[PDB]
Amino acid sequence: AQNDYTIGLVDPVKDYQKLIETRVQVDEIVDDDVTKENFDRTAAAARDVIWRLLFDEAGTSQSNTEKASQLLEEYRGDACFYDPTPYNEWIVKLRDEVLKKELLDFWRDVLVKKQLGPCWSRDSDLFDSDDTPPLEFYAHAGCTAPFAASLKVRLEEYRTLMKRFVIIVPDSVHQASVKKIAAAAREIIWKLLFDGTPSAEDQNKAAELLQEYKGDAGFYGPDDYNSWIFNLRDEVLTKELLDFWRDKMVKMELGPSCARDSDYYDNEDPLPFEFYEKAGCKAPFE
Amino acid sequence: SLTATPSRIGQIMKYGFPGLDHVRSHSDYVLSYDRRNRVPHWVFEHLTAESVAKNDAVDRSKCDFKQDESIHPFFRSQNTDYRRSGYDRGHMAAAGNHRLHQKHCDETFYLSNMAPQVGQGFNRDAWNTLEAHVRRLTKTYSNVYVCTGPLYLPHKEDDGKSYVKYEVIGANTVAVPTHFYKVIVGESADHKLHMESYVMPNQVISNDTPISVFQVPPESVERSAGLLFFDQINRKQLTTINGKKVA
Amino acid sequence: TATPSRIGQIMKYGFPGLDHVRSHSDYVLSYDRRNRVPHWVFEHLTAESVAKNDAVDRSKCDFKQDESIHPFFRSQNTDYRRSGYDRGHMAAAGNHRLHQKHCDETFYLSNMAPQVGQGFNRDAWNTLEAHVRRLTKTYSNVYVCTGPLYLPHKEDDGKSYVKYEVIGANTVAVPTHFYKVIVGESADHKLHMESYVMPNQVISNDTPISVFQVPPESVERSAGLLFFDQINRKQLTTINGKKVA
Ligand SMILES: [Mg+2]
Ligand SMILES: [Mg+2]
């Protein structure tokens, strides 16, 4: 039933756990007032049964004391999170009954050894180090708190230049420092290729730089590159540097920057097929 | 027109604000900036056929990625953060959604509008496909409202516990989101409202993957983002959600 | 029954941010809906407001969900139970002793982040909270901002990542660190700042809290917030015990 919190003496811990699981640990949004009462009613049923298991004189202590110990431990673990006060007050009366009836093994082996007295900062987020530890609870029948002792104690020319000069720096300044190395890359390439008829060595050195200058341009803004690369191609073709055109500019895809090489572009952007479509060549892509 | 205008902000934000963290207005989009992560919490856009139409007067080639000086220096992403990071500077408010004027487009290139996105297979492909779809929605709906933003979603580990984990790049520790969303409302000719919402992972996605597979209930985006979208619309008054009729 | 609004008094030195700001009777909170914990809380303390009061009994207070938060973003007791984490006050209950109600309001789960219990929440973090309260003996007024951090670590690959646990069905974020940034006002009207970052982990009871003092600007850079932005840092007399000169 809805308003019944039955904990049988057959499997007390299991009956107790089912009530918590269904009435308290609900992963649906519930009024905290409801949840608090649900736990208070489960707690009260648990306390009743523990008291009976220990003192009723039915059954055998062998069996019933073990049942009480297990239920007490499970119940206390929940009380530390949901409601330590009722547990803290009741556990004092339980001890007092335990001692009066001279159940000293249960006092020593269970309540003391398993530290099942009042909840405190060792076991509950409802407490902290400035609260008074429940040391005194345990100081009965020759026992002390197990925690008592603890408390007493408590190309590469271009690269290197880019590595040196390229911190909160205004865009236009950093733009210019990038341009200075960009212009300096463009001007030596034009020398290497057009001071006369370029050697195989100097065609390699021009292609070397142009690939890395393109890569950097694709990040810093390839708009200058995209204009100028057309001028370079036209001069390559006027000077008849066919070897340079085919094996370097075409083969290594040194045309305009695009979505293949740069985050300035995406899918919908038109690829630069037309740039490569000279001297019989085609774009190295698709 | 050429600056943030009170009438336009109120037009863009017709259906409410997803959140109120560090909200900034540009000429044609609205941005909430996440100072901790150095990327937006969200951006908001109101698209029409006119505003997404190709305009000869808009040259995207004149636009460069630049630091946003209206953000305190401690919380600005910089080009240095993204350089050789393995990530693109990915627009939240896409440059193609803002073609009424050059400056409208220019303003999408502030690094405060950027988040690290996988390039090939996402920013440049699959994510663009979603962007292109939202623009094409203007041919169905006269007005298309869209909120775009990052997510940082948990995964399970060998210990059985759940964890959020993400790379942060550069000296400014720019966060790399695990996923991105778009939550979209179109207004039809009659007074009907239609919602779409997508969540796509920030990773290489196959080019043959249709964007439809990334459709998610809007409430699951809300729960993950810590935001409420289109709060002025009761969801019981939508006509469809991800192509599915509402009661 | 003072005339100026309490939120205005507490927030004298600025707002670190303006996301989802709630004013309680004696503290101010900005709530992080994505993480289901605060971005920050702010308190203004005096000797009176932190003094032991017969009329305030912390044991009468209950941890409760904040019904003013939308259901999607609300942390719940079920999220913390057997998580391995305490429900950790950002605005500590011991800081708000003028009235029972002021104390009760710090037990809203919206004021909580997951905190390591023994060795942290219950101990070292409490030691810092007690230190901030003790400052009201030196300074007439003590202003303090407390909040979570989610700090990156570097891995074998030379890359940096932010990693943190999320607990319960409501995926409540477990911060990696917490800070307090504190300003005391002297009787000579001079301003003194302190600034701590502590890891959300077991800390030895032997560890002096001074070990955890860091420059305030480091906390700001990491938090994505500005603290006491109405004080020019050249206006301060000391920062973490050292003279500004
Ligand atoms: Mg893009
Ligand atoms: Mg605490």
Indicate whether A183 and A107 sit together in one domain: no
Tell me how long chain C is. 245
Alpha helices in chain B (DSSP H): 6-12, 49-52, 79-82, 102-106, 126-136, 218-225
Please report how the helices A32-55 and A84-100 are oriented relative to each other, as an axis angle in degrees rounded to 10.
Answer: 10
Residue B8 · residue B26 · CB < 8 Å: no
**Considering CB atoms only, which of A219, A220, A268 is closest to B132?**
A268
What contacts B36, CB < 8 A, 6 or more positions away? B75, B175, C150, C222, C223, C224, C225
Residue A55 · residue A64 · CB < 8 Å: no
**Residues of C with a known catalytic role:** 89
Question: CA nearest B109: which of B143, B53, B59?
Answer: B59
What contacts A195, CB < 8 A, 6 or more positions away? none
Question: CA nearest B47: which of B118, B123, B136, B128?
Answer: B136
Nearest ligand to the C-alpha of residue B180?
1
How close is the Cα of C157 to the center of ligand 1, in Å? 27
- Helix (H) / strand (E) containing C78: helix C77-80
**Considering CB atoms only, which of A168, A171, A268 is closest to B128?**
A268
CA atoms A254, A255, A259, A264: torsion sign: positive
**Considering CB atoms only, which of C64, C88, C122 is closest to A127?**
C122
How close is the Cα of A53 to the center of ligand 1, in Å? 70
**Residues of B with a known catalytic role:** 91
Q: Do A171 and B66 touch (CB under 8 A)?
A: yes
d(CA C148, CA C31): 11
Nearest ligand to the C-alpha of residue B124?
1
Residue C40 · residue C225 · CB < 8 Å: yes
How close is the Cα of C110 to the center of ligand 2, in Å? 14
CATH for A191: 1.25.40.240
Q: Do B226 and C161 touch (CB under 8 A)?
A: no
Q: Do A26 and C81 touch (CB under 8 A)?
A: no
d(CA A76, CA B7): 61
| Interchain contact B119–A (C-beta under 8 A) | yes
Residue A42 · residue A5 · CB < 8 Å: yes
- Opening angle at CA C135, ends C114 and C52, nearest 5: 75
| Interchain contact A286–B (C-beta under 8 A) | no
User: Distances in Å between the alpha carbon of A96 and those of A44, A52, A104, A113, A268?
Assistant: 18, 15, 11, 17, 82
Indicate whether A90 and A117 sit together in one domain: yes
Residue C114 · residue C88 · CB < 8 Å: yes
Query: What is the SS3 assignment for A159-203?
Result: HHHHHHHCCCCCHHHHHHHHHHHHHHHHHHHHHHHHCCCCCHHHH
Beta bridge partners of B66: B110
Amino acid at B14: K
Alpha helices in chain A (DSSP H): 12-23, 32-55, 61-82, 84-100, 104-105, 148-153, 156-165, 171-194, 200-220, 223-238, 242-244, 273-276
Task: Work out the burial of residue B65: count CB atoms within 10 Å of its CB; fewer than 13 is exposed, 13-18 middle, 19 or more buried.
Answer: buried
Residue B230 · residue B193 · CB < 8 Å: no
Reduced to 3 states, what is the DSSP secondary structure of residue B205? coil
Dihedral (Cα; C231, C235, C240, C245), 10-degree rounding: 160
- Two tokens, residue C161: 């990542």
Distance from CA of A179 to the nearest CA of C (A): 30
- Two tokens, residue B202: 């920030």
Residue B154 · residue B67 · CB < 8 Å: no
Resolution value, angstrom units? 2.2
C67 is in an annotated binding site: no
Neighbours of ion ligand 1 (CB under 5 A): B 90-91, 123
Instruction: For chain C, list the contacting chains (3+ Cβ pairs, <8 Å).
Output: A, B
Indicate whether A277 and A187 sit together in one domain: yes
End position of a domain, from candidates A119, A136, A154: A154
- Two tokens, residue A244: 């340079």
Going along B27-129, which residue ranges are E strands?
30-34, 39-47, 88-91, 114-117
Contacts of B223 in chain C (CB under 8 A): 72-73
End position of a domain, from candidates A122, A137, A154: A154
Indicate whether A135 and A207 sit together in one domain: no
Amino acid at C25: S
d(CA B131, CA C141): 53
- In A, minimum Cα distance to B125 occurs at A267
Domain architecture of chain B: domains with CATH: 1-247 (3.40.570.10)
Nearest ligand to the C-alpha of residue B132?
1
Name the pairing type of β-strands B114-117 and B143-151: unpaired
d(CA B145, CA B228): 14
User: Distances in Å between the alpha carbon of C75 and those of A220, B84, B201?
Assistant: 45, 39, 26
d(CA A207, CA A188): 11
What phi and psi, each to the nearest 5 degrees, are found at residue B216? -135, 145
d(CA C14, CA B174): 26
User: Distances in Å between the alpha carbon of B234 and those of A9, B195, B197, C67?
Assistant: 53, 12, 16, 20
- Rg for chain A, CA atoms, rounded: 42
d(CA A127, CA A134): 12
Reduced to 3 states, what is the DSSP secondary structure of residue C101? helix
What contacts C115, CB < 8 A, 6 or more positions away? C85, C86, C87, C88, C121, C125, C178, C200
B242 is in an annotated binding site: no
Indicate whether A208 and A109 sit together in one domain: no
Name the pairing type of β-strands B240-241 and B193-201: parallel
- Helix (H) / strand (E) containing C132: helix C124-134
- Rg for chain B, CA atoms, rounded: 17
Experimental technique, in short, is X-ray
Residue C240 · residue C193 · CB < 8 Å: yes
Name the pairing type of β-strands B244-245 and B240-241: antiparallel
Amino acid at C84: G
Buried b (16+ CB within 10 A) or exposed e, C185-208: eeeeeebbbbbbbbbbeebeeeee
**Considering CB atoms only, which of B34, B36, B162 is closest to C171?**
B162
Indicate whether A207 and A234 sit together in one domain: yes
What contacts C135, CB < 8 A, 6 or more positions away? C45, C142, C182, C184, C194
| Interchain contact C34–B (C-beta under 8 A) | yes
Residue C195 · residue C214 · CB < 8 Å: yes
What phi and psi, each to the nearest 5 degrees, are found at residue B220? -75, -35
Number of domains in chain A: 2
Domain with A134, as residue range(s), is 1-154
End position of a domain, from candidates A154, A172, A196: A154
Indicate whether A149 and A172 sit together in one domain: no
d(CA B105, CA B59): 9
Indicate whether A187 and A142 sit together in one domain: no
- Two tokens, residue B44: 């908001």
Indicate whether A80 and A202 sit together in one domain: no
d(CA C59, CA C54): 12
User: Distances in Å between the alpha carbon of A263 and those of B11, B117, C52, C238?
Assistant: 31, 10, 62, 47
Question: CA nearest A64: which of A78, A50, A74, A76?
Answer: A50
d(CA A99, CA A70): 20
Contacts of A257 in chain B (CB under 8 A): none
d(CA A158, CA C98): 69
Name the pairing type of β-strands C86-89 and C28-32: unpaired
Residue C193 · residue C241 · CB < 8 Å: no
Amino acid at B40: P
- Rg for chain C, CA atoms, rounded: 18
Question: CA nearest B94: which of B113, B71, B70, B117?
Answer: B113
Indicate whether A134 and A212 sit together in one domain: no
Beta bridge partners of B39: B34
Indicate whether A244 and A263 sit together in one domain: yes
Indicate whether A142 and A267 sit together in one domain: no
